[PDB]
Structure 1
Amino acid sequence: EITGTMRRLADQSLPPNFSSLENFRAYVDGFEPNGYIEGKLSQMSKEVNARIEPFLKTTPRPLRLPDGPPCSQRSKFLLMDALKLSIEDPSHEGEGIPLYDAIKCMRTFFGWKEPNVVKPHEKGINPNYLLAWKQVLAELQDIENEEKIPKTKNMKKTSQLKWALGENMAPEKVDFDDCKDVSDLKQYDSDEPELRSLASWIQSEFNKACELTDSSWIELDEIGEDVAPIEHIASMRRNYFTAEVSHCRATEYIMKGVYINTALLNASCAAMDDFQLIPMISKCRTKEGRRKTNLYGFIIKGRSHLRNDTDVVNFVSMEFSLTDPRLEPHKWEKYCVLEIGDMLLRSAIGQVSRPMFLYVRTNGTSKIKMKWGMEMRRCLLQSLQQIESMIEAESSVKEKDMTKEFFENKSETWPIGESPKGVEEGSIGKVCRTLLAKSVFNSLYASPQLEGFSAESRKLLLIVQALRDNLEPGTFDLGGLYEAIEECLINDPWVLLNASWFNSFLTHALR
């Protein structure tokens, strides 16, 4: 029985022309359909409608991209501008002590100079980066002196690293009843991100991420012995896949990111109050067959008292390179660049003696970003799954297995990028590497803008595909869809590049 308060609340929860729950119940129990929907439809204005605007070849316009200063590198490590020192040591993927391996990979380089600043940060204190480099070198030599190399090395807490790692920068936490009459007391800054226009360097990074290399970067685990014929077919498919994919810079980035994020997470959980030096290590395997260890640089993890999954741990990254920062300075907005050595590479005009720079920067990561970058290997799944789908979709057509023909005879060719002469097609392996690089870059440059744009451009891609299939497609508000796509292009290089790709696709389709 409903009684008391919950009866009154019942009387105030009905349509507006009723005053009692019992009268409403009686009206419903007596209600019999007598053509009400049609009547109110006749009364409703005819301006409220869903007129279908046809969608033709001339209908879709290009996507507008934002205007502003060019976009700068966001990745946590260098992608194409990275350098490797090597020692050729027979040590498997993890079978070593990172600091001892790093010392061995650094001892093999001669040509070190007194470091000086080349491209300043422009917002920081470059002498602090200089002192941090010198401190790293001093500590490495100190480790060298010690009889046994520490598994994990802590760094001294000098002013250069207190500054470069954001120490005592958070504001103090007080009670609102103790800071009311302060002038500049206000809400956190919540505005549109700064606008940034697309640049040419992201397309070159993607071009090189899709390239072959002279080493192997993926040594998978073992599996049971194959007993069924379909297991042998799957094993041959996987062997072809790994052959095509293992020599690709995308796999190198996978390994770099997995190692770096594993190391950062473990160092953050283990040493929360201390700063810690973490070498950047990756073990490849040259085509001759010798395994090689490779050092890209060093990280300096600050403190890591991370409570929420969004809390930020700051670190200082230093990476070796040969690329001059004065040819694309807008790419290195957040970087300080020193000059650290000279290198004589394999030259036929004597020896070149190109200089060797160190890209130094302050960066940060979260528990979730570390977790999600330590699992970039799923990209290999995404890519290869799509490839396998394609292959099986063709094997059903030709009643026979299609792995060998596809992967060897190279007859089939899929448009995989446009040259100035026109659209250029590639073999199944180039498609595999392209999709792998796409997934890897989705993992490296992941943002809410990417999600939003991906969805809102999937919708337009599907409308354009319906148009291409001669399925007389139509829309109800296309300018709204466009404004929803363009709402996500703000400042992210990867998203702006995807938008450029979508514009090129619309230009080359619809013909």
Structure 2
Amino acid sequence: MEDFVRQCFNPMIVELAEKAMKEYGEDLKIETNKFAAICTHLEVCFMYSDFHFINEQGESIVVELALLKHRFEIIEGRDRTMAWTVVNSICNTTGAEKPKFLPDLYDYKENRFIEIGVTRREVHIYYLEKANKIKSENTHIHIFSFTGEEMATKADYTLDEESRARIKTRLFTIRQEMANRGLWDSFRQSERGEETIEERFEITGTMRRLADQSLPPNFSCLENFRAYVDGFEPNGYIEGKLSQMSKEVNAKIEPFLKTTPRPIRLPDGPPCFQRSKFLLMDALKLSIEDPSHEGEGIPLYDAIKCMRTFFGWKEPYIVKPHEKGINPNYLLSWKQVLAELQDIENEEKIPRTKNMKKTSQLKWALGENMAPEKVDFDNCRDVSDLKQYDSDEPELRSLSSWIQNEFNKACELTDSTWIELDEIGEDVAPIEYIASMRRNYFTAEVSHCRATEYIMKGVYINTALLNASCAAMDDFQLIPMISKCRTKEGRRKTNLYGFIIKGRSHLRNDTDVVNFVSMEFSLTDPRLEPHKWEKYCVLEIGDMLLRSAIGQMSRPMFLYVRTNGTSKIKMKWGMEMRRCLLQSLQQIESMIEAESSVKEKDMTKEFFENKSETWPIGESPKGVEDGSIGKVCRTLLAKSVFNSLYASPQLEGFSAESRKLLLVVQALRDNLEPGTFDLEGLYEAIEECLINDPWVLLNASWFNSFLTHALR
């Protein structure tokens, strides 16, 4: 590089190399290796003939700090003309003959010319070109190297060891600190004999033929195309092309008025059904009633102790058939679960985990006999009744009124805590105080919500199921559903929800599926909404005593049984649900900051402790209702939880298109004269992202209800 040469050599050498390049007719930017070669050659030549003098008696001595012969005269510091003149003068006054080319220096002590060479390859090969280039004449040749080598004619180095050592060390140091910065390879691979070449690159072959037909249709050779491109001047091409284009190519704007938008069309058909992993609104718990503070045991024993606290089991019987399968298998599975839970005592050693006996009904439930067999296509080419795959158009379903009820119930408050966060250091800066009060208010408002209970349930269940699947691979293990909380007065409590029986898990990748069957307790009669439960089998198993008010009243107890299998990736997806709180806090803080940016002061006080402010987040036949800040915080948390629990691409598409439409509507409401180019296609996108998911249908209904009020 240029900067390296600038900072390495002294300027006195530098101006001469530039003059030499100008005389030659080269450039310093295009080629740089030749610059370094000339600088090194000039430096070596100047160093080779310095601090040398010869006394009148004929002996040569080295001195530092009167009029004595210099014993050397420089020729390389001069251009061709005066170099030839001085060479002619000296050979005439000494009787010498003109050798051929320009020698480097002349020594009076031996009365003979000297040539100096520096090479990047090794000396032995480089010697021969100089030897056979100049022959049958008296001219010494000395060759150095960048790695300590040296060689001269007749092995008579007419110099002391010290100067040669200095030259060799200078060359070694320049090479050593050149190779460190990353410039030695190109410099070394740049000497093609006695010239310097920057680089080389040619097409020369199959690449040329391939490049030949990679051109516009009116060309045949790459060179002709390059020549045409090089001599290009723009006269009128763009305007001329534009003048002869048809007028149907246009982008016309149609105004967006208050009467323009129309409600979105929803699909029609049979009602939808629940498809969540665990039921949410219709669950109860069997509390363990404050275990000891030192109690930390296996979940199986906790489940057993929770079970022993209930009396009232009866003969179970089916109340709602699954209409696809065998219900006696479900009855036998439940009875086997009860029997194998009770039969623990017939063991000399108490086990840690329970492995279920492989029974016919369990095998049918887990689908261990419905595995298709795989053979090569060659033998089964002649078989009949062969289809591609399950490439069937999805069914269309309408919207029911139970998802709204679930969302309504998910935003209420409970009597437990469900979450306890740890502590941090004390605050000093005022911004730390502001952040602390913000997060303290947010934590206080949403601590006792039901969505936290759902998050904890999902995390515990997914972690336990993943651990069981990774531990045992060829056993039918029993996995309980267990959660923990703190009571109002401050007693830890453990709750049991149901049971899960896992099949066979041999997972090699992250897409393989593992099957299981789930049984859950409930008090909700399925005969009120038969359409909601379509993939469930419901049993009546016992009676429950309620202590509400005076006296004791009995209600039936039901069991919901379902067969499923999720994934290996979705277990990891379910283990991270604590991020919804973070997202809700981010949204609240973003709104606070956005409002505070305009009214340039701190708005954390006008949001929380103010009690005269209300936000419209409700609806009724009367109209639009209002609520407090805690209510909207819980609503956002519930929305995040339900978004986590009902993931689908339809949600992504609907969210994007609805975001665009909402932005257009908001632009309309600000008196900014909006406009569109194609309002329909956005709509047909919105309906084509509206196939089956009840959550997306509820979101579309919410958008329609927002639209009917936003412009009225």
State the shift of 1:341 in Å.
1.4
Question: How many correspondences in the alignment?
Answer: 511
Change (3 A) 1:507 1:288: same
| SS of equivalent residue, structure 1 residue 330 | coil
Instruction: Determine what percentage of the aligned residue pairs are the same residue.
Output: 96
Question: Matched residues in 1 for 2:599 and 2:229: separation?
Answer: 63
State the shift of 1:90 in Å.
4.0
Question: Matched residues in 2 for 1:96 and 1:437: separation?
Answer: 33
Change (3 A) 1:46 1:81: same
The 10-residue stretch of structure 1 (85-94 or 12-21) with the greater mean CA deviation from structure 2: 85-94
Deviations 1:275-299 (A, max 9, x none): 2211111112222222211111111
Question: Matched residues in 1 for 2:643 and 2:567: separation?
Answer: 17
Question: Matched residues in 2 for 1:473 and 1:179: separation?
Answer: 63
Change (3 A) 1:36 1:400: closer
8 Å Cα contact 1:92-1:283 kept in structure 2? no
The 10-residue stretch of structure 1 (397-406 or 54-63) with the greater mean CA deviation from structure 2: 397-406
Deviations 1:303-346 (A, max 9, x none): 22223323222111111111111111111111111111111223
State the shift of 1:405 in Å.
5.0
Question: Matched residues in 2 for 1:252 and 1:92: separation?
Answer: 22
Matched, 1:409 2:641: no
State the shift of 1:446 in Å.
0.7
Report what 2:442 is aligned to.
241
The 10-residue stretch of structure 1 (224-233 or 254-263) with the greater mean CA deviation from structure 2: 224-233
| SS of equivalent residue, structure 1 residue 433 | helix
| SS of equivalent residue, structure 1 residue 395 | helix
Question: Matched residues in 2 for 1:396 and 1:360: separation?
Answer: 54
1:63 to 247, 259, 264: 264
2:313 to 98, 106, 112: 112
Change (3 A) 1:149 1:53: farther
Question: Matched residues in 2 for 1:357 and 1:297: separation?
Answer: 12
| SS of equivalent residue, structure 1 residue 413 | coil
Change (3 A) 1:179 1:382: same
The 10-residue stretch of structure 1 (27-36 or 97-106) with the greater mean CA deviation from structure 2: 27-36
RMSD value, Cα = 2.2
Question: Matched residues in 2 for 1:146 and 1:393: separation?
Answer: 66
| SS of equivalent residue, structure 1 residue 466 | helix
Question: Matched residues in 2 for 1:375 and 1:94: separation?
Answer: 27
Change (3 A) 1:497 1:307: farther
Deviations 1:162-208 (A, max 9, x none): 22122132311221222212212222112332211111111111111
State the shift of 1:237 in Å.
2.6
Change (3 A) 1:300 1:333: same
Question: Matched residues in 2 for 1:381 and 1:193: separation?
Answer: 36
| SS of equivalent residue, structure 1 residue 284 | strand
State the shift of 1:440 in Å.
0.4
1:188 to 380, 389, 397: 389
Change (3 A) 1:92 1:489: farther
The 10-residue stretch of structure 1 (117-126 or 188-197) with the greater mean CA deviation from structure 2: 188-197
8 Å Cα contact 1:98-1:151 kept in structure 2? no
Change (3 A) 1:88 1:192: same
Report what 2:651 is aligned to.
450
Structure 2: runs of 5+ lacking an equivalent: 1-201
Change (3 A) 1:221 1:140: farther
Change (3 A) 1:85 1:209: same
8 Å Cα contact 1:410-1:428 kept in structure 2? no
Question: Matched residues in 2 for 1:298 and 1:409: separation?
Answer: 47
8 Å Cα contact 1:117-1:126 kept in structure 2? yes
| SS of equivalent residue, structure 2 residue 262 | coil
Deviations 1:33-63 (A, max 9, x none): 2222222222222112221222222222111
State the shift of 1:395 in Å.
4.8
State the shift of 1:358 in Å.
0.9
Change (3 A) 1:221 1:356: same
State the shift of 1:118 in Å.
0.8
TM-score, reference length from structure 1: 0.94
| SS of equivalent residue, structure 1 residue 306 | coil
Question: Matched residues in 2 for 1:200 and 1:62: separation?
Answer: 20
Report what 1:140 is aligned to.
341
The 10-residue stretch of structure 1 (164-173 or 137-146) with the greater mean CA deviation from structure 2: 137-146
| SS of equivalent residue, structure 2 residue 374 | strand
Change (3 A) 1:97 1:225: farther
State the shift of 1:146 in Å.
5.5
Question: Matched residues in 1 for 2:646 and 2:293: separation?
Answer: 29
State the shift of 1:18 in Å.
2.2
The 10-residue stretch of structure 1 (325-334 or 172-181) with the greater mean CA deviation from structure 2: 172-181
State the shift of 1:399 in Å.
6.6
State the shift of 1:508 in Å.
1.6
Q: Who wins on radius of gyration, i.e. which is larger?
A: 2
| SS of equivalent residue, structure 1 residue 326 | coil
State the shift of 1:422 in Å.
1.0
| SS of equivalent residue, structure 2 residue 598 | coil
State the shift of 1:398 in Å.
6.2
8 Å Cα contact 1:210-1:249 kept in structure 2? yes
Change (3 A) 1:408 1:285: farther
Change (3 A) 1:155 1:195: same
8 Å Cα contact 1:93-1:282 kept in structure 2? no
Structure 1: runs of 5+ lacking an equivalent: none
The 10-residue stretch of structure 1 (13-22 or 378-387) with the greater mean CA deviation from structure 2: 13-22
Question: Matched residues in 1 for 2:346 and 2:601: separation?
Answer: 64
| SS of equivalent residue, structure 2 residue 661 | helix
| SS of equivalent residue, structure 1 residue 85 | coil
Question: Matched residues in 1 for 2:298 and 2:369: separation?
Answer: 32
2:302 to 83, 101, 108: 101
The 10-residue stretch of structure 1 (400-409 or 79-88) with the greater mean CA deviation from structure 2: 400-409
State the shift of 1:435 in Å.
0.7
8 Å Cα contact 1:103-1:144 kept in structure 2? no
Change (3 A) 1:23 1:179: same
Question: Matched residues in 2 for 1:166 and 1:158: separation?
Answer: 12
8 Å Cα contact 1:321-1:356 kept in structure 2? yes
Question: Matched residues in 2 for 1:323 and 1:144: separation?
Answer: 34
Change (3 A) 1:340 1:224: farther
Change (3 A) 1:463 1:3: same
Q: Which of structures 1 and 2 has the larger relative contact order (alpha carbons within 8 angstroms, sep 6+)?
A: 1
Question: Matched residues in 2 for 1:25 and 1:191: separation?
Answer: 55
Deviations 1:384-424 (A, max 9, x none): 21112223444556676554553343322222121221112
The 10-residue stretch of structure 1 (401-410 or 483-492) with the greater mean CA deviation from structure 2: 401-410
Question: Matched residues in 2 for 1:156 and 1:504: separation?
Answer: 54
Change (3 A) 1:40 1:390: same
8 Å Cα contact 1:119-1:336 kept in structure 2? yes
State the shift of 1:71 in Å.
0.8
State the shift of 1:361 in Å.
0.3
2:499 to 298, 306, 311: 298
| SS of equivalent residue, structure 1 residue 360 | strand
Question: Matched residues in 1 for 2:350 and 2:667: separation?
Answer: 63
The 10-residue stretch of structure 1 (40-49 or 421-430) with the greater mean CA deviation from structure 2: 40-49
Report what 1:332 is aligned to.
533
TM-score, reference length from structure 2: 0.68
Change (3 A) 1:136 1:427: same
State the shift of 1:24 in Å.
2.1
8 Å Cα contact 1:99-1:149 kept in structure 2? no
Change (3 A) 1:57 1:272: farther
| SS of equivalent residue, structure 2 residue 549 | coil
